[PDB]
Amino acid sequence: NAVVRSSPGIYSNCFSLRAPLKPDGPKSFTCDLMGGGVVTDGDTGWQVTVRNTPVSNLLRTAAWKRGTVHVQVVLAGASVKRSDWDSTVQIFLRQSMATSSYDAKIWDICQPGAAMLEFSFDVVGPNSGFEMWDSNWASQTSWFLEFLISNPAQNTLFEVNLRLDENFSVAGTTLMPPFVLD
Amino acid sequence: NAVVRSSPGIYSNCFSLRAPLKPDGPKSFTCDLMGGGVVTDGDTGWQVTVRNTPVSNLLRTAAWKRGTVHVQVVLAGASVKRSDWDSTVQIFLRQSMATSSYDAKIWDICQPGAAMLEFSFDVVGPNSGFEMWDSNWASQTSWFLEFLISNPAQNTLFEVNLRLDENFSVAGTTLMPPFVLD
Amino acid sequence: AIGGGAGAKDSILMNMTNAYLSLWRYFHGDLVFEVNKMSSPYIKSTVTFFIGFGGVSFQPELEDFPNKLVQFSEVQEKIELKFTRAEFLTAWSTQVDPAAQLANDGCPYLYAMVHDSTASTIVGDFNLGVTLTRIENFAGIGCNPGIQGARLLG
Amino acid sequence: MDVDLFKLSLDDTSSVKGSLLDTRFAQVRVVIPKAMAGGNELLNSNLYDILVVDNNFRAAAALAHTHIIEGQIKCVCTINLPENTGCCLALCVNSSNRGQFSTDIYTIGSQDRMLWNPACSKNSTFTFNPNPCGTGWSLEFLRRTKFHISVVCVSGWSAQPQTDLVMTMDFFVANVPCVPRIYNLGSPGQTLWLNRWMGKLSFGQGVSNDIKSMPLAIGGGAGAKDSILMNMTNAYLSLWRYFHGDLVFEVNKMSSPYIKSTVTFFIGFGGVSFQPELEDFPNKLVQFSEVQEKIELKFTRAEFLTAWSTQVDPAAQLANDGCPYLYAMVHDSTASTIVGDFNLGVTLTRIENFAGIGCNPGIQGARLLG
Amino acid sequence: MDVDLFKLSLDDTSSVKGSLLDTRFAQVRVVIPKAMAGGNELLNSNLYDILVVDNNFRAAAALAHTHIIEGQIKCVCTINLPENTGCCLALCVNSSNRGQFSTDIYTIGSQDRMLWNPACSKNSTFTFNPNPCGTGWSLEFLRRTKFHISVVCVSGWSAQPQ
Structure with a gap:
């Protein structure tokens, strides 16, 4: 195997999810990378925490955003033998959760034990390149990351990390409820 | 598989750890990359040695440090079959060991037999970019590397190597007890 | 912080x-504060503002720091005071863990002490509002991984 | 009468400056015992731990309530002794401190050091910068960064005095601006300041x-x-x-001035057995007077053919060592009337024209000094 | 290293000078009671008896160890009150003092005096010379010549404060 080398920046952990203990079939969830919301398509038992890192606080409490965002996704599994791994993860980077829309990026990985991937996108908008979250002004939308799990009894932990680029810019303030600590 | 190519520098081995012979569950430890200290969260049986390489001697016996540090971590395992490997290693690059802080970088790897990874960080500070170790002057802190092992009966040896960049700088001297040879 | x-x-x-x-x-620069009077103008006091460290216990020989004396008139409502960056030696941390002790906090403080007593005829209190408006000559150093928690105001 | 208090000059952020009477802030005296040996410490403490204890001078509160001071600290130690005795005192300062450190002369005498013999000098002064990476300091900076100071004895009495003495010193704020001394790794300068304690040389009578x-x-x-x-x-x-350059040594006299000798210094190789025809190398003859205390000698880089290794394994033989040596031999006998020995202290201060070659993987171990 | 200690600048006989932060040497606060009348004294003591008690400022030891000071003492009193009340405070200074003297406004308010009403002025300052027959003074001079100071109330409250 080759060496494990990642991006030379510093990534703040925003979302942290944990699958339920006793599942039955495939599970799925969705994370809002610009609004700070997680919707898990299923029942309870999902342990979902949204951290209070400064990148997540800046992406929540700002109105107009413009620039490149780097995402790093880390999938962690349980302690099972390498000859019995049968879990596959499908990742969809989308711009809306409506059925009429289309996925912007598609990944499909199956790595035993633990896996790591990374990508980046651009938040551009209609104002001067600036985009507000889910506004009805120019029918703007957010960025969504959807995860589909084939065997949730093998991979359990899901970590999403973010890092803003050096061309990022923000303007305006958005009033929000106070963030519950964890 | 692809070829195994690493960084073109020369890396000095600073820390060398060995797991105990008969474990029970998950084990964990933490290495201080700037102060030269290792704390193993558990009982005895851990064989921990801190080498007297010139990079470690310079990082210990200097007060004000500034520049880029390259780290290379090498994990070695025992002689077990490839169809029975079930050990996963989680690595956290942090800046403090307090519970209120957050991890700066997260890795999670599961490679049978032996694994190698590498990264780098920047020691910057408040003085003129210079940072002293664990001072109460500007509430400065060190850099910590935390290892969490899922199955310590498979991977045993842990080697941390360091290499200073060409933009590194030091100033001032720090009095310390004499270093015990090994 | x-x-x-x-x-x-x-x-x-x-x-x-x-x-x-x-x-x-870390960040560094000269700070510009604005002090507003939020009480009745029949409640008068003289307040000395200065930059200190740690936790002091009101020594009377504390005005040896370069301090600013603020004394409001009746028509005077808001006063801008600027602490230059010659009062700060190095940069200091943007974020400090709130579970730490007073001796384990290296960031500077802004101290306000009453120079004389608070004199009035009504039964109110003397209220002030401090607002750090801008930081000139701003220099940011490093990248923050983040510290969970924040301290209470007032 | 009503003046505006906001227009008063209560915002003077200037540093302390003036004469030596208006700039002193601390004065500390230490007890030198009657019967001391070589290596024991006389004082070791943080500078803040002795700068605020019973020191109320003209610039004490002005130093305690100033955020930025832009002058280097000048220290003057005054202790005198007659010429029929002798010792050696070293005042060393450091930037930080850890738990249960070592009080060796080699460890503490690296950053800022003043090493002198009171039997040859009436008083000794030296200037240092508390912030090596900046151009300013304060008292809270020295409190928080744990700035250390230590007075140690590196060579004891040749002849003991009548009673135990007291050496006083007083700290000032000199009219010298603070400059930084930064050791860069990639591009080093043409002069490398080391102040390395090479060792103590004791020639018997x-x-x-x-x-x-x-x-x-x-x-x-x-x-x-x-x-x-x-x-x-x-x-x-x-x-x-490997490294290469012309070396600058300083030789200090650590014995009584009634013990006289002539020492030849030269550069050799391997292990010699005192051949009398060994002065055919270009050598330097050092002969101290009574007022002469410290002599600087510079070996130019025409004495070195190529570069040599920075580190040599201490388990190797004398024939298996290729690095050059510094040899000191007595030209004549050691003549005195007291029963002491002739002591010298060699310190490689700086290496001019410094050229570093390669990268060291490291060799565990080091040789003993002296 | 050997320097001559006789050529050092340890003989500076210059007076204290600079800004107002570098020239303050004493700061004394006095308690004005809630219900006071006209004529009672709030403070009466020698200047040395209050200038050396717990006053450690930037020019305190420099004033205590200077033989000749060639500057006049500037005093700034700061007390403010609203306009629905009023009194009158007098700070008077004298050159000497005898046994069991009188604390009348007519007696003490002759040499140097600052008389003001705090309901109309935010702060009041005045300058005086401790040596009326010379051009210099010192702290030992004020200690030995029994230089007196007194703050008295010459007109009480129109309306009492809280």
Whole structure:
């Protein structure tokens, strides 16, 4: 195997999810990378925490955003033998959760034990390149990351990390409820 | 598989750890990359040695440090079959060991037999970019590397190597007890 | 150490300026504060503002620091005072863990002490509002991984 | 009468300056015992721990309530002794401090040091910068960064005095601006300040054939009983594999001035056995007077053919060592009337024209000094 | 290293001078009671008896160890009150003092006096010379010549404060 080398920046952990203990079939969830919301398509038992890192606080409490965002996704599994791994993860980077829309990026990985991937996108908008979250002004939308799990009894932990680029810019303030600590 | 190519520098081995012979569950430890200290969260049986390489001697016996540090971590395992490997290693690059802080970088790897990874960080500070170790002057802190092992009966040896960049700088001297040879 | 937001009952309060400031690890510059009078003008006091460290216990020989004496008139409502960056030796951390002790905090403080007593005929109190408006000559150093929690205001 | 208090001059952020009477802030006296040996410490404490204890001078509160001071600290130690005795005192300052450190002369005498003999000098002064990476300091900075100071004895009494003495010193704020001294790793300068303690040379009386040697493979630190001693200059030098330049040594006299000798210093190789025809190398003759205390001698880089290794394994033989040595031999006998020995202290201060070659993987261990 | 200690600048006989932060040497606060009348004294003591008690400022030891000071003493009193009340405070200084003297406004308010009403002025300052027959003074001079100071109330409250 080759060496494990990642991006030379510093990534703040925003979302942290944990699958339920006793599942039955495939599970799925969705994370809002610009609004700070997680919707898990299923029942309870999902342990979902949204951290209070400064990148997540800046992406929540700002109105107009413009620039490149780097995402790093880390999938962690349980302690099972390498000859019995049968879990596959499908990742969809989308711009809306409506059925009429289309996925912007598609990944499909199956790595035993633990896996790591990374990508980046651009938040551009209609104002001067600036985009507000889910506004009805120019029918703007957010960025969504959807995860589909084939065997949730093998991979359990899901970590999403973010890092803003050096061309990022923000303007305006958005009033929000106070963030519950964890 | 692809070829195994690493960084073109020369890396000095600073820390060398060995797991105990008969474990029970998950084990964990933490290495201080700037102060030269290792704390193993558990009982005895851990064989921990801190080498007297010139990079470690310079990082210990200097007060004000500034520049880029390259780290290379090498994990070695025992002689077990490839169809029975079930050990996963989680690595956290942090800046403090307090519970209120957050991890700066997260890795999670599961490679049978032996694994190698590498990264780098920047020691910057408040003085003129210079940072002293664990001072109460500007509430400065060190850099910590935390290892969490899922199955310590498979991977045993842990080697941390360091290499200073060409933009590194030091100033001032720090009095310390004499270093015990090994 | 104004980064991280403001404290609340198992909660934090944020805005985009504090979130933008909390990206760096250290910051340095000369600070510009505005002091507003929020009480009746029949309640008068003289307040000395200075820059200190740690936790002091009101020594009377504390005005040996370069301090600013603020004494409001009746028509005077808001006063701008600027602490230059010759009062700060090095940069200091944007964020400090709130579970730390007073001796384990290296960031500077802004101290306000009454020079004389508070004199009035009504039964009110003397209220002031401090607002750090801008930071000139701003220099940000490093990158903040983040510290969970914030201290209470007032 | 009503004046505006906001227009008063209560915002003077200027540093303390003036004469030496208006700039002193601390004065500390230390007890030198009657019967002391070589190596024991007389004082070791943080500077804040002795700068605020019963020191109320003209610039004390002005120093305690100033945020930025832009002058280097000048220290003047005054202790005098007659010429029929002798010792050696070293005042060393450091930037930080850890738990249960070592009080060796090699460890503490790296950053800022003043080493003198009171039997030859009436008083000794030196200036230092508390912030090596900046151009300013404060009292809270010295409180928080744990700035250390230590007065140690590196060579005891040749003849004991009548009673135990007291050496006083007083700290000032000199009219010298603070400059930074930064050791860069990638692009080092043409002059590398080391101040490395090479060792102490003790020539006895009535000894015919004695010759001392000091290895120039100075990297790796100093040896100790299953231990090594380090500082940041030797750790910075031990990064390269080979080094080359012209060396500048300082020789101090640590004995009484009634013990006289003539010492020839030269550069050699391997292990010699005191041949009398050894002065055919270009050598320097050092002969101290009574007022003469310290002499600087510079070996130019025409004495060195190529570069040599910074670090040599201490388990190797004398024939298997290729680094040059510094040899000191007595030209004549050691003549005195007291029963003491002739002591010298060699310190490699700086290496001009410094050229570093390669990268050192490291060699565990170091040789003993003296 | 050997320097001559006789050529050092340890003989500076210059007076204290600079800004107002570098020239303050004493700061004394006095308690004005809630219900006071006209004529009672609030403070009467020698200047040395209050200038050396717990006053450690930037020019305190420099004033205590200077033989000749060639500057006049500037005093700034700061007390403010709203316009629905009023009194009158007098700070008077004298050159000497005898046994069991009188604390009348007519007696003490002759040499140097600052008389003001705090309901109309935010702060009041005045300058005086401790040596009326010379051009210099010192702290030992004020200690030995029994230089007196007194703050008295010459007109009480029109309306009492809280």
